[PDB]
Amino acid sequence: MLYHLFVNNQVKLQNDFKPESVAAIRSSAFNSKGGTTVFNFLSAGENILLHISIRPGENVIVFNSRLKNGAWGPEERIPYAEKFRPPNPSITVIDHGDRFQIRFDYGTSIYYNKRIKENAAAIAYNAENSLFSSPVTVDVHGLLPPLPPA
Amino acid sequence: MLYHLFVNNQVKLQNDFKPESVAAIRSSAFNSKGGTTVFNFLSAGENILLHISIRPGENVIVFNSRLKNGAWGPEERIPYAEKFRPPNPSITVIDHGDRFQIRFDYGTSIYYNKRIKENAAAIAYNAENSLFSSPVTVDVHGLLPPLPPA
Amino acid sequence: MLYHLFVNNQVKLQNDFKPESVAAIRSSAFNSKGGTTVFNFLSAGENILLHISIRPGENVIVFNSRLKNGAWGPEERIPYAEKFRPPNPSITVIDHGDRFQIRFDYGTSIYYNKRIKENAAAIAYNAENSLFSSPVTVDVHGLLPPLPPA
Amino acid sequence: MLYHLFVNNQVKLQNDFKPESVAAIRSSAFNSKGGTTVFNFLSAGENILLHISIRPGENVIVFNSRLKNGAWGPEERIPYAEKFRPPNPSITVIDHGDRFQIRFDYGTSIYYNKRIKENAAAIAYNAENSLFSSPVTVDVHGLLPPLPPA
Ligand SMILES: CC(=O)N[C@H]1[C@@H](O[C@H]2[C@@H](O)[C@@H](CO)O[C@@H](O[C@H]3[C@H](O)[C@@H](O)[C@H](O)O[C@@H]3CO)[C@@H]2O[C@@H]2O[C@@H](C)[C@@H](O)[C@@H](O)[C@@H]2O)O[C@H](CO)[C@H](O)[C@@H]1O
Numbered sequence: 002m003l004y005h006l007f008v009n010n011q012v013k014l015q016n017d018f019k020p021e022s023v024a025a026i027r028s029s030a031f032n033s034k035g036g037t038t039v040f041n042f043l044s045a046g047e048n049i050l051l052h053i054s055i056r057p058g059e060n061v062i063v064f065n066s067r068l069k070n071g072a073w074g075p076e077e078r079i080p081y082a083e084k085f086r087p088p089n090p091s092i093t094v095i096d097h098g099d100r101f102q103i104r105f106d107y108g109t110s111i112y113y114n115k116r117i118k119e120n121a122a123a124i125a126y127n128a129e130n131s132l133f134s135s136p137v138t139v140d141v142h143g144l145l146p147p148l149p150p151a
Numbered sequence: 152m153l154y155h156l157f158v159n160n161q162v163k164l165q166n167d168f169k170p171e172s173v174a175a176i177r178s179s180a181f182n183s184k185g186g187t188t189v190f191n192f193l194s195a196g197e198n199i200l201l202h203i204s205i206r207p208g209e210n211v212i213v214f215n216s217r218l219k220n221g222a223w224g225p226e227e228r229i230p231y232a233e234k235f236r237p238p239n240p241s242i243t244v245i246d247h248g249d250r251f252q253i254r255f256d257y258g259t260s261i262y263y264n265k266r267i268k269e270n271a272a273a274i275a276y277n278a279e280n281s282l283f284s285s286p287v288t289v290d291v292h293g294l295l296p297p298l299p300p301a
Numbered sequence: 302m303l304y305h306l307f308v309n310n311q312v313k314l315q316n317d318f319k320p321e322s323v324a325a326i327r328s329s330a331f332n333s334k335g336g337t338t339v340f341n342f343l344s345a346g347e348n349i350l351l352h353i354s355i356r357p358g359e360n361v362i363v364f365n366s367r368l369k370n371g372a373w374g375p376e377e378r379i380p381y382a383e384k385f386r387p388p389n390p391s392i393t394v395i396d397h398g399d400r401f402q403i404r405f406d407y408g409t410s411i412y413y414n415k416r417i418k419e420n421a422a423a424i425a426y427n428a429e430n431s432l433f434s435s436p437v438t439v440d441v442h443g444l445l446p447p448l449p450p451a
Numbered sequence: 452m453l454y455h456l457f458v459n460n461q462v463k464l465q466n467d468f469k470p471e472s473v474a475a476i477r478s479s480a481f482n483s484k485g486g487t488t489v490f491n492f493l494s495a496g497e498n499i500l501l502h503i504s505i506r507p508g509e510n511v512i513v514f515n516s517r518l519k520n521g522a523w524g525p526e527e528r529i530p531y532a533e534k535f536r537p538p539n540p541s542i543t544v545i546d547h548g549d550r551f552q553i554r555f556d557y558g559t560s561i562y563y564n565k566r567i568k569e570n571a572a573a574i575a576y577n578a579e580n581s582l583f584s585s586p587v588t589v590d591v592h593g594l595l596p597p598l599p600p601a
């Protein structure tokens with residue numbers, strides 16, 4: 002399922018993002034002088050199951066979760082440097098039931114254990130000066146599709 | 152190369168759309184009550200090398216070419232009915248040197264012999280009430296990439 | 302990297318099968334009257350890191366591990382029915398660092414926690430009357446490749 | 452549809468190879484000291500619709516056709532060098548109705564106009580000391596499948 006997620010907006014998924022689901026996010030650009038850029042996977046109750054905060058200024062990418070009107074939990078971080086590949090950087094999120102797997106363009110995957118047991122009904126995108134294009138292309142799979150040789 | 156082509160706009164290709172090039176256009180929607188929708192491949196001189204006019208009202212898809220300030224040549228047509236697949240219809244254009252190959256979601260390909268010998272520097276998208284989403288996702292390949300099993 | 306793995310034989314991998322690695326096994330056939338068919342991921346020292354025993358007669362698929370000539374550990378099994386899709390059934394294995402994700406044609410993925418801290422140097426295929434073809438096509442990725450829209 | 456085509460043998464296709472059809476041939480190896488390696492697309496009556504003779508010693512790749520026990524027609528050749536990429540070289544053939552498009556790992560496509568109005572029922576592979584592996588992996592599509600972004 003193809004979606005066009007605009008900056009400071011969200012897309013309501015036709016089907017819940019649940020175990021086995023795959024979300025491939027791709028940008029048509031990389032604004033080197035962009036600021037903090039966020040992607041959230043929200044439950045129907047608007048809980049933030051997965052919060053991805055890309056902070057080039059802090060040279061870090063932050064992961065977290067929180068209830069609609071609840072506090073954040075302890076953050077999980079990794080260096081921002083050399084993770085994305087210009088000019089079409091991407092982010093891939095896979096739901097493995099008990100945890101999310103996040104892959105950027107380079108390096109090893111990031112594994113984030115779930116903290117809220119619900120599926121996502123929407124994906125939101127936030128930024129004052131996005132590191133990426135608006136909108137971003139988002140292909141959501143109900144399962145991993147057949148792979149090409151390379 | 153990923154591009155986001157907005158309705159009534161165009162995208163300047165980083166590389167010329169020439170022989171071997173592949174353009175996969177995908178929409179995140181299908182507005183059943185949409186009107187005539189056009190896609191043009193333009194040379195740097197703004198010549199319309201390939202004109203694709205989707206006319207649901209006329210139940211036809213028209214192909215043509217013309218110089219920046221020149222007249223159209225004789226049209227090439229095919230029925231519009233059962234060509235696209237909702238909700239994410241697509242159009243694929245491949246440059247085979249002496250002719251373009253156009254594939255929609257269903258049916259056989261359409262072959263349009265070239266009438267202007269130039270490569271394309273841009274792709275334009277026109278519609279008052281687009282049949283597709285705005286923008287549309289466009290992946291341009293310099294050559295056919297490795298294929299998946301299915 | 303493409304390999305052709307013959308029944309009762311094995312392929313020596315060019316690079317170690319480790320975290321991020323993906324093995325897409327595909328058969329050119331499905332022999333209905335076939336018997337127990339096995340696939341093993343072996344370490345350099347020949348430890349069976351991951352054992353997949355497909356048993357049609359017992360209607361189960363058994364997952365296990367064991368050192369070279371050691372004792373098998375507790376078996377992790379699932380029902381065999383409605384897992385493979387003919388005529389080209391497939392098996393996809395992904396190394397996630399602390400566990401393996403195994404995917405068949407139907408159903409949800411299977412997760413098998415690692416038990417031996419070593420990477421796989423080879424993949425073996427055993428069967429007296431294989432459920433699949435000989436050889437089977439095997440594409441091994443060092444990391445998940447770009448995905449098609451569908 | 453996946454097939455395993457062995458050297459000096461052939462695969463009988465499930466469906467005819469006709470317009471829109473795509474055959475992605477891939478080898479799990481590249482034998483440098485190999486000799487003339489051939490691939491033929493045969494009609495039901497065994498006419499050689501498309502003959503691809505890869506000759507390293509003559510530094511050319513020869514394209515031709517001929518009825519079952521008939522005379523070969525004029526040869527269409529190109530240089531052999533810098534066409535295949537080891538260790539997994541490939542050959543992709545697409546039927547475009549009035550001609551075939553042949554793609555190797557490097558260079559531009561080769562276009563071969565049809566000479567015998569019949570579809571192919573089988574694909575044969577001949578070689579005394581093959582440049583490729585035995586078998587070679589062959590995925591045949593009834594039409595171009597969705598493409599990955601890269
Ligand atoms: C920033 C955005 O677009 N989304 C929200 C969101 O922002 C906060 C989350 O990203 C959160 C993830 O754990 O981190 C917060 O920053 C924390 C620092 O990482 C931490 O070192 C420090 O101890 O505490 C701060 C604040 O909790 C994000 O907060 C925002 O950015 C920071 C730099 C600061 O400017 C703060 O005032 C901002 O709120 O969530 C907040 C509300 O929690 C807003 O809704 C953002 O728009």
Ligand SMILES: CC(=O)N[C@H]1[C@@H](O[C@H]2[C@@H](O)[C@@H](CO)O[C@@H](O[C@H]3[C@H](O)[C@@H](O)[C@H](O)O[C@@H]3CO)[C@@H]2O[C@@H]2O[C@@H](C)[C@@H](O)[C@@H](O)[C@@H]2O)O[C@H](CO)[C@H](O)[C@@H]1O
Nearest residue numbers: 187188189202203204213214215216223224225226277278
């Ligand atoms: C419509 C659009 O978005 N692009 C341009 C473009 O429109 C014309 C082309 O699509 C052209 C392709 O051959 O067909 C024209 O319609 C022709 C009919 O197909 C044909 O049966 C009849 O004999 O002649 C007409 C006009 O040449 C398209 O013309 C437009 O749509 C038609 C239905 C009519 O409303 C006409 O007034 C419109 O111009 O090119 C034109 C200029 O040539 C405009 O720039 C459109 O915006």
Ligand SMILES: CC(=O)N[C@H]1[C@@H](O[C@H]2[C@@H](O)[C@@H](CO)O[C@@H](O[C@H]3[C@H](O)[C@@H](O)[C@H](O)O[C@@H]3CO)[C@@H]2O[C@@H]2O[C@@H](C)[C@@H](O)[C@@H](O)[C@@H]2O)O[C@H](CO)[C@H](O)[C@@H]1O
Nearest residue numbers: 337338339352354363364365366373374375376427428429
């Ligand atoms: C074809 C192949 O590679 N088989 C090997 C392999 O077979 C054993 C493993 O698959 C092992 C994994 O847990 O299971 C063994 O069967 C067990 C049954 O699952 C369990 O219900 C029963 O209580 O105990 C047995 C023994 O541990 C497999 O053993 C072979 O198949 C079973 C069905 C039985 O016929 C037994 O006699 C066989 O040994 O590993 C063995 C060595 O352990 C051989 O190398 C097989 O060729």
Ligand SMILES: CC(=O)N[C@H]1[C@@H](O[C@H]2[C@@H](O)[C@@H](CO)O[C@@H](O[C@H]3[C@H](O)[C@@H](O)[C@H](O)O[C@@H]3CO)[C@@H]2O[C@@H]2O[C@@H](C)[C@@H](O)[C@@H](O)[C@@H]2O)O[C@H](CO)[C@H](O)[C@@H]1O
Nearest residue numbers: 487488489502504513514515516523524525526577578579
């Ligand atoms: C391995 C294989 O499948 N080869 C077949 C096949 O070989 C002939 C075709 O490849 C044919 C395609 O045009 O070319 C023939 O060679 C020609 C040379 O290209 C041309 O320069 C020369 O002047 O004339 C020859 C003959 O037509 C292929 O013929 C075989 O290989 C050549 C190099 C030579 O050694 C000749 O004696 C061989 O027959 O088809 C033949 C039957 O025509 C056999 O079935 C091969 O096994």
